[PDB]
Design an enzyme around this catalytic site. Structure first.
Site, PDB file in Angstrom:
ATOM      1  CB  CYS A  62      -0.945   0.026   1.205  1.00  0.00           C
ATOM      2  SG  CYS A  62      -1.875   1.572   1.315  1.00  0.00           S
ATOM      3  CD  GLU A  81      -5.632   3.022  -6.588  1.00  0.00           C
ATOM      4  OE1 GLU A  81      -6.135   1.958  -6.162  1.00  0.00           O
ATOM      5  OE2 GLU A  81      -5.621   4.080  -5.926  1.00  0.00           O
ATOM      6  NE  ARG A 125       2.487   0.625   3.590  1.00  0.00           N
ATOM      7  CZ  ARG A 125       3.617  -0.071   3.692  1.00  0.00           C
ATOM      8  NH1 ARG A 125       3.904  -0.693   4.824  1.00  0.00           N
ATOM      9  NH2 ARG A 125       4.468  -0.145   2.666  1.00  0.00           N
ATOM     10  CD1 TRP A 143      -6.717   9.846  -1.632  1.00  0.00           C
ATOM     11  CD2 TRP A 143      -7.688   9.918   0.387  1.00  0.00           C
ATOM     12  NE1 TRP A 143      -5.765  10.245  -0.723  1.00  0.00           N
ATOM     13  CE2 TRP A 143      -6.337  10.298   0.523  1.00  0.00           C
ATOM     14  CE3 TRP A 143      -8.497   9.895   1.529  1.00  0.00           C
ATOM     15  CZ2 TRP A 143      -5.782  10.652   1.751  1.00  0.00           C
ATOM     16  CZ3 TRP A 143      -7.941  10.243   2.749  1.00  0.00           C
ATOM     17  CH2 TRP A 143      -6.599  10.625   2.848  1.00  0.00           C
TER      18      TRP A 143
HETATM   19  C1  HEM Z   1      -5.978   6.740   1.731  1.00  0.00           C
HETATM   20  C2  HEM Z   1      -5.573   6.624   0.465  1.00  0.00           C
HETATM   21  C3  HEM Z   1      -5.037   5.286  -0.082  1.00  0.00           C
HETATM   22  C4  HEM Z   1      -4.389   5.179  -1.237  1.00  0.00           C
HETATM   23  C5  HEM Z   1      -4.051   6.340  -2.203  1.00  0.00           C
HETATM   24  C6  HEM Z   1      -4.040   3.791  -1.423  1.00  0.00           C
HETATM   25  C7  HEM Z   1      -3.365   3.292  -2.511  1.00  0.00           C
HETATM   26  C8  HEM Z   1      -3.131   1.966  -2.734  1.00  0.00           C
HETATM   27  C9  HEM Z   1      -2.682   1.395  -3.988  1.00  0.00           C
HETATM   28  C10 HEM Z   1      -2.435   2.192  -5.289  1.00  0.00           C
HETATM   29  C11 HEM Z   1      -2.523   0.081  -3.809  1.00  0.00           C
HETATM   30  C12 HEM Z   1      -2.073  -0.923  -4.897  1.00  0.00           C
HETATM   31  C13 HEM Z   1      -3.179  -1.941  -5.152  1.00  0.00           C
HETATM   32  C14 HEM Z   1      -3.659  -1.926  -6.580  1.00  0.00           C
HETATM   33  O1  HEM Z   1      -3.001  -1.313  -7.458  1.00  0.00           O
HETATM   34  O2  HEM Z   1      -4.717  -2.553  -6.838  1.00  0.00           O
HETATM   35  C15 HEM Z   1      -2.876  -0.236  -2.424  1.00  0.00           C
HETATM   36  C16 HEM Z   1      -2.844  -1.477  -1.824  1.00  0.00           C
HETATM   37  C17 HEM Z   1      -3.347  -1.778  -0.571  1.00  0.00           C
HETATM   38  N1  HEM Z   1      -3.953  -0.864   0.271  1.00  0.00           N
HETATM   39 FE1  HEM Z   1      -3.906   1.163   0.183  1.00  0.00          FE
HETATM   40  N2  HEM Z   1      -4.512   3.063  -0.340  1.00  0.00           N
HETATM   41  C18 HEM Z   1      -5.137   3.954   0.513  1.00  0.00           C
HETATM   42  C19 HEM Z   1      -5.753   3.604   1.695  1.00  0.00           C
HETATM   43  C20 HEM Z   1      -5.825   2.358   2.268  1.00  0.00           C
HETATM   44  C21 HEM Z   1      -6.581   1.973   3.456  1.00  0.00           C
HETATM   45  C22 HEM Z   1      -7.494   2.922   4.271  1.00  0.00           C
HETATM   46  C23 HEM Z   1      -6.359   0.661   3.663  1.00  0.00           C
HETATM   47  C24 HEM Z   1      -6.866  -0.280   4.782  1.00  0.00           C
HETATM   48  C25 HEM Z   1      -7.358   0.183   5.941  1.00  0.00           C
HETATM   49  C26 HEM Z   1      -5.451   0.204   2.632  1.00  0.00           C
HETATM   50  C27 HEM Z   1      -4.971  -1.069   2.508  1.00  0.00           C
HETATM   51  C28 HEM Z   1      -4.329  -1.567   1.412  1.00  0.00           C
HETATM   52  C29 HEM Z   1      -3.953  -2.948   1.271  1.00  0.00           C
HETATM   53  C30 HEM Z   1      -4.205  -4.053   2.343  1.00  0.00           C
HETATM   54  C31 HEM Z   1      -3.365  -3.083   0.073  1.00  0.00           C
HETATM   55  C32 HEM Z   1      -2.746  -4.391  -0.485  1.00  0.00           C
HETATM   56  C33 HEM Z   1      -3.573  -5.277  -1.396  1.00  0.00           C
HETATM   57  C34 HEM Z   1      -2.741  -6.537  -1.572  1.00  0.00           C
HETATM   58  O3  HEM Z   1      -1.968  -6.922  -0.634  1.00  0.00           O
HETATM   59  O4  HEM Z   1      -2.855  -7.176  -2.647  1.00  0.00           O
HETATM   60  N3  HEM Z   1      -5.153   1.252   1.812  1.00  0.00           N
HETATM   61  N4  HEM Z   1      -3.229   0.951  -1.806  1.00  0.00           N
HETATM   62  C1  LIG Z   2      -8.627   1.669   0.321  1.00  0.00           C
HETATM   63  C2  LIG Z   2      -8.079   1.753  -1.094  1.00  0.00           C
HETATM   64  C3  LIG Z   2      -7.541   2.931  -1.589  1.00  0.00           C
HETATM   65  C4  LIG Z   2      -7.046   2.967  -2.910  1.00  0.00           C
HETATM   66  N1  LIG Z   2      -6.524   4.097  -3.430  1.00  0.00           N
HETATM   67  N2  LIG Z   2      -7.101   1.871  -3.683  1.00  0.00           N
HETATM   68  C5  LIG Z   2      -7.631   0.720  -3.216  1.00  0.00           C
HETATM   69  C6  LIG Z   2      -7.673  -0.500  -4.101  1.00  0.00           C
HETATM   70  C7  LIG Z   2      -6.333  -1.190  -3.910  1.00  0.00           C
HETATM   71  C8  LIG Z   2      -6.535  -2.669  -3.715  1.00  0.00           C
HETATM   72  C9  LIG Z   2      -6.747  -3.504  -4.805  1.00  0.00           C
HETATM   73  C10 LIG Z   2      -6.926  -4.870  -4.619  1.00  0.00           C
HETATM   74  C11 LIG Z   2      -7.157  -5.770  -5.815  1.00  0.00           C
HETATM   75  C12 LIG Z   2      -5.879  -6.512  -6.202  1.00  0.00           C
HETATM   76  N3  LIG Z   2      -6.012  -7.262  -7.470  1.00  0.00           N
HETATM   77  C13 LIG Z   2      -5.693  -8.675  -7.224  1.00  0.00           C
HETATM   78  C14 LIG Z   2      -7.359  -7.155  -8.062  1.00  0.00           C
HETATM   79  C15 LIG Z   2      -6.901  -5.396  -3.331  1.00  0.00           C
HETATM   80  C16 LIG Z   2      -6.695  -4.546  -2.243  1.00  0.00           C
HETATM   81  F1  LIG Z   2      -6.663  -5.033  -0.989  1.00  0.00           F
HETATM   82  C17 LIG Z   2      -6.505  -3.190  -2.434  1.00  0.00           C
HETATM   83  F2  LIG Z   2      -6.311  -2.388  -1.366  1.00  0.00           F
HETATM   84  C18 LIG Z   2      -8.119   0.638  -1.918  1.00  0.00           C
END
Ligand code: HEM
Ligand SMILES: Cc1cc(N)nc(CCc2cc(CCN(C)C)cc(F)c2F)c1
Ligand code: HEM
Ligand SMILES: Cc1cc(N)nc(CCc2cc(CCN(C)C)cc(F)c2F)c1
Ligand SMILES: C[C@H](O)[C@H](O)[C@H]1CNc2nc(N)[nH]c(=O)c2N1
Ligand SMILES: C[C@H](O)[C@H](O)[C@H]1CNc2nc(N)[nH]c(=O)c2N1
Ligand SMILES: [Zn+2]
Lengths: 411, 416
Positions: free
Chosen positions: B113, B290, B116, B285
């Site tokens: 993520c 994305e 963070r 957000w």
């Molecule tokens: C607040 C703005 C946030 C932004 C801009 C953000 C951005 C991202 C992005 C770009 C990814 C890559 C995943 C993808 O491309 O599909 C990601 C993954 C992830 N985010 Fe964040 N996120 C945010 C908030 C959060 C929050 C609030 C949580 C949980 C409470 C979270 C938990 C995660 C997790 C668990 C992943 C990993 C998914 C995996 O392991 O495959 N994120 N995030």
């Molecule tokens: C809270 C939040 C903010 C943000 N900006 N974007 C997201 C989506 C990212 C995201 C995508 C996936 C699918 C992974 N793939 C195998 C389809 C799993 C996740 F756990 C995750 F967090 C979530």
């Protein structure tokens, strides 16, 4: 244990059995992945050398369908004898060619490996002096450049003996632009080469102090002090960089050399170490336009290009950097193609690598591949390699990094 | 034992000790790196009292350390309380403060993520008293309304009851709370989001009357207490959407594109002190790429590069014209412009990656490390002009954590 990799764009699933033949270590453990570390840590007693030679000869005779035969056992015995006696051994020409092609084939960070079997290997193991090294390197450059129809090649200088008689090319690439630290604190030319540009000046060279000065060669034979040699300019193919739409682009005064030729790596074949083994191919466009031109620690031209494009540089969310980036890389490809110098764009090269992977899985059981390095530095996810799972493991023969000689040389 | 990571653009070197507190496996070995495998065995998730108290003890030790009460009477009594609750009931319940801490640290520990820097400002909604699918629908609606906040998005997570015997799981069958339907046509083409075709088919089979357009918000499919899931429609007034236009290209609006404002992941598993929360939707957000890179331009998604490139009239015959790269930038400009113009929270990839580097440096200083997955942190366009490209990152697994879990339609035992 018979692992599988998926392509998430196409659902193609490949099964990897080649990793089981892996010999060296990755630096990862089950508690930590070091997949993004640039360089993890990863002389030979008579004990270490013969198994290494056995492994190599075994795969060599298998490749020519003579495993467990006449010639195989004889050659094993003969090399066994030589190590017991000389505490080293010499490769036959056929084995040297095989070892070099397979070092490239095994380079998990190299996207251009679909060409691995066409490598032209120049045996320079009879070289004794830096003047002779210079001669071999000029011939390599001329052959590889081929008036712009670039051809892959490697030149292999004598192998390490006791660590005191090392052959080394001190340049990181045969052709690179000088870098100078300015009085006002900035940097003229290539900042990545500031230190080397000093070890040339602060050792003999006479610098033009321009923005694109081809560095001289610093060649070290048999462990002696290295010597400066200028590559004949008629051998250094360069490409002036213009844009097919922006006439002011030509006014930026950019150029680059046609031949990428890595000269500071170590080639390991059957336990033997070749410390001087410059190799060359042809560029992928992003190597120049994204990394060389737009890295902040390199020529760093993004600001100036965007200003001449009159983009809104007030806020990052206008994506002015990304916009300039695309144009710069259009111009590089356009310029090389216009001057008929071989170059490949990142779309074509990554598509070739996917086909190469499928070939290697079908005919070899796998293909070690480093995603962090294979995915291009721009437009990552619109290239097919972004969606391709890859297994990274270390096969031999291999290219390996080695310390910079000026930190090591008993001067 | 200490470990160093180097930023090759700045030469800043950082020292990781936090990886010593790691337990879960990565998937890699000394002889193979699995760093690019999408779902390794160890990132996915059927648990007895045998292994549960050490997991609880470790979590409570961490919790009481963060509140500067390690070894206190409150700490020792809580350990004793949890122990007796486990042996007598085979599980235990977290206090509200522990749940909040656990959810915040699961985000803090999410090595993929990039967002963070925000981890400590998470709004935690305790839905552990929920019992029915209708009650889930109500909790999710309040989450969506709170998190959306009229465009001024706020991070939030809603936590439904933990797993007990794995036969009574709470699950949100949607992968995200808001997502567009996809429909496979008989001619082989797809209408809408191709990534959601399988889930769309399940909703239709469960009785959803599909509008069969290109941007239909899917219904919620909600499973309480291991019962069959039930369909619910999110109130449209709660689903904030953004029409996509371009600031220079007036023809861009005529492409008919829009996207929803709230990214809300709803299929992951939250593990806290050995407890498994199988339904824990969370939202933040968007980062612009994305939507602009993956959702719109993945060949297997809406796949708009060709039609965009056509309207721009780029040379599309040879790929070396970089017409794909040129269209990609303009589409990502349009996404950011549209969200900002409508005052919906969004962050571009330059800002987000820069914030992540500052976050990561701070975590090395105050925490001893920051587990990070380069393969996922680097943005899917313009990689090396962001500072994370040049950053060495160590990837390891800490708990509390978010884990993957199998899709519920593959494991659910239907009641009928
Ligand atoms: C607040 C703005 C946030 C932004 C801009 C953000 C951005 C991202 C992005 C770009 C990814 C890559 C995943 C993808 O491309 O599909 C990601 C993954 C992830 N985010 Fe964040 N996120 C945010 C908030 C959060 C929050 C609030 C949580 C949980 C409470 C979270 C938990 C995660 C997790 C668990 C992943 C990993 C998914 C995996 O392991 O495959 N994120 N995030
Ligand atoms: C809270 C939040 C903010 C943000 N900006 N974007 C997201 C989506 C990212 C995201 C995508 C996936 C699918 C992974 N793939 C195998 C389809 C799993 C996740 F756990 C995750 F967090 C979530
Ligand atoms: C012919 C066309 C070739 C292309 C397009 C190509 C492309 C690339 C690229 C883009 C990289 C990434 C490294 C970087 O970004 O600096 C790379 C790495 C590498 N290439 Fe190739 N290459 C070619 C030929 C060759 C040849 C002929 C050899 C050796 C015989 C070779 C050996 C390697 C090695 C060893 C590495 C990685 C070094 C490391 O492990 O860090 N390449 N290549
Ligand atoms: C033959 C060839 C063709 C091509 N197209 N590009 C190249 C350059 C790739 C390359 C770069 C490096 C520097 C590593 N960096 C972290 C400083 C080391 C290498 F061993 C290497 F092969 C070579
Ligand atoms: C820190 C990170 O490993 C480093 O920036 C790597 C990332 N990927 C790369 N990929 C290629 N092809 N070349 C590089 O120099 C790098 N650098
Ligand atoms: C095969 C590879 O692991 C896969 O395509 C990954 C690469 N990196 C990613 N990075 C992000 N942020 N999101 C993704 O979906 C992916 N996909
Ligand atoms: Zn690894």
């Amino acid at each position: 244990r018979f692992l599988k990799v998926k392509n998430w764009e196409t659902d193609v699933v490949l099964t990897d059995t080649l990793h089981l033949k892996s010999t060296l270590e990755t630096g990862c453990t089950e508690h930590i992945c070091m997949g993004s570390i640039m360089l993890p840590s990863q002389v030979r007693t008579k004990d270490q050398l013969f198994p290494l030679a056995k492994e190599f000869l075994d795969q060599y005779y298998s490749s020519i369908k003579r495993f467990g035969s006449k010639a195989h056992m004889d050659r094993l015995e003969e090399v066994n004898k030589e190590i017991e006696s000389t505490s080293t051994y010499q490769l036959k020409d056929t084995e040297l060619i095989y070892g070099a092609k397979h070092a490239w084939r095994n380079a998990s960070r190299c996207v251009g490996r679909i060409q691995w079997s066409k490598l032209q290997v120049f045996d320079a193991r009879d070289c004794t002096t830096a003047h002779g090294m210079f001669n071999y390197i000029c011939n390599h450059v001329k052959y590889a450049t081929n008036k712009g129809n670039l051809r892959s090649a490697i030149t292999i200088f004598p192998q390490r003996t006791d660590g005191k008689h090392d052959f080394r090319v001190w340049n990181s690439q045969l052709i690179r632009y000088a870098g100078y630290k300015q009085p006002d604190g900035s940097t003229l030319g290539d900042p990545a080469n500031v230190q080397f540009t000093e070890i040339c000046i602060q050792q003999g060279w006479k610098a033009p102090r321009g923005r694109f000065d081809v560095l001289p060669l610093l060649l070290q034979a048999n462990g002696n002090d290295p010597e400066l040699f200028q590559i004949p300019p008629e051998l250094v193919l360069e490409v002036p960089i213009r844009h097919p739409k922006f006439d002011w682009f030509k006014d930026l005064g950019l150029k680059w050399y046609g031949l990428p030729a890595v000269s500071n790596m170590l080639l390991e074949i059957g336990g033997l170490e070749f410390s001087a083994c410059p190799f060359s191919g042809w560029y992928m466009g992003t190597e120049i336009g994204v990394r060389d031109y737009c890295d902040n620690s390199r020529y760093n031209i993004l600001e100036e290009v965007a200003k001449k494009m009159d983009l809104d540089m007030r806020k990052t969310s206008s994506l002015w950097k990304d916009q300039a980036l695309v144009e710069i890389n259009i111009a590089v490809l356009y310029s090389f193609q216009s001057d008929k110098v071989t170059i490949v764009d990142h779309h074509s090269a990554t598509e070739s690598f996917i086909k190469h992977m499928e070939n290697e899985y079908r005919c070899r059981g796998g293909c070690p591949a480093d995603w962090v390095w294979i995915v291009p530095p721009m437009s990552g996810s619109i290239t097919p390699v972004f969606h391709q799972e890859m297994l990274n493991y270390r096969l031999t023969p291999s290219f390996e990094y080695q310390p910079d000689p000026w930190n090591t040389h008993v001067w």
